[PDB]
Paper text:
In the case of the orthorhombic (P212121) crystal form there are eight molecules inside the unit cell, and two molecules are in the asymmetric unit (chains A and B). Similarly, we refer to chains A and B in the orthorhombic form as Orth(A) and Orth(B), respectively. Comparison between the lower resolution orthorhombic crystal structure obtained at pH 6.0 (1.8 Å) and the monoclinic structure revealed nearly identical results to the higher pH (pH 9.0) counterpart. In the case of the Orth(A) and Mono structures, the key residue Lys61 has ∼80% k1 conformation and ∼20% k2 conformation under a high-pH condition (pH 9.0). This shifts to ∼50% k1 conformation and ∼50% k2 conformation as the pH decreases to 6.0, and finally to ∼20% k1 conformation and ∼80% k2 conformation under an acidic pH condition (pH 4.8). It appears that strong hydrogen bonding between the Trp66 indole and the k1 conformation of Lys61 is responsible for the high occupancies of the k1 conformation in the Orth(B) structure. Considering that Orth(B) has an unstable structure compared with Orth(A) and Mono, and this instability is linked to crystal contact IIAB as detailed in Section 3.3, it is evident that the alteration of the Lys61 conformation in the Orth(B) structure is a result of orthorhombic crystal packing.
WasCFP was further improved to enhance its stability across a broad range of pH levels and temperatures, incorporating 13 additional mutations. Spectrally, [name] exhibits green fluorescence (λex/λem = 493/502 nm) at physiological and higher pH levels, contrasting with cyan fluorescence (λex/λem = 429/475 nm) under acidic conditions (pH < 6).
Numbering used by the authors: 2 to 64, 68 to 231
The structure:
């Protein structure tokens, strides 16, 4: 793939999410720029249906691993860019410990020069009085590793990781992520050796924005293969 060639400069990003958590329907739209050369994404997300019925931090992982910086010695392990421009399906289940689960399905592909992430999210079995529907989570940076492995049989990848969400009482809400990505196209893709993506995030508010929103500055770096 000259999949990788589509990411050498700054790429416009569009995100669309339709969600239903315990029957509470909502939509999010996002925009920004990705600069994979520096593993960088600069984003702003809007709840387009009024108030988000779940905390922003619970949606971060759902709301474009194609923008990761793969060091030169690891470029042969970059499935995500290899599937472009036709794109990939990203499916997850996220199990929130002692609470509900999200099931997500996304299509990540180019529409002309724009990288588009279209997402549907279904959440079930949440506690109306719990840390999620009760909005008891810190609005603070998420960082850490996404472990990537080949899925030869599906010509794709699997991923797993646990996110540790800070709770306002000082406890941690564990969110166990199970991920499967498959190419949309039937052209060849790169099936990687085991590695991980290391994400560093800064999250903020726009003081002039009245809509429920989230501003993100993300840096994502492939790692786990030496040299």
């Amino acid at each position: 793939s000259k999949g990788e060639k589509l990411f050498t400069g700054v790429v416009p990003i569009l995100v669309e999410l339709d969600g239903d958590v315990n029957g509470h329907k909502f939509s999010v739209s996002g925009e920004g720029e990705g600069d994979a050369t520096y593993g960088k994404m600069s984003l702003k997300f809007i709840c387009t249906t009024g108030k988000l019925p779940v905390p922003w931090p619970t949606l971060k992982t759902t709301l474009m691993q194609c923008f990761a910086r793969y060091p030169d010695h690891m470029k042969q392990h970059d499935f995500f860019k290899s599937a472009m421009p036709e794109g990939y399906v990203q499916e997850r289940t996220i199990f929130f410990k002692d609470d509900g689960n999200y099931k997500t399905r996304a299509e990540v592909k180019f529409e002309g020069d724009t990288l588009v992430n279209r997402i549907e999210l279904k959440g079930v079995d949440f506690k109306e009085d719990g840390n999620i529907l009760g909005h008891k989570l810190e609005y603070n940076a998420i960082s850490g590793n996404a472990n990537i492995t080949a899925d030869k049989q599906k010509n794709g990848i699997k991923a797993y990781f646990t996110i540790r969400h800070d709770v306002e009482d000082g406890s941690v809400l564990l969110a166990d992520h199970y991920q499967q990505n498959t190419p949309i196209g039937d052209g060849p893709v790169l099936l990687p050796d085991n590695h991980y993506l290391s994400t560093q995030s800064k999250q903020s508010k726009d003081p002039n924005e009245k809509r429920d929103h989230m501003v993100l500055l993300e840096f994502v770096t492939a790692a786990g293969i030496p040299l």
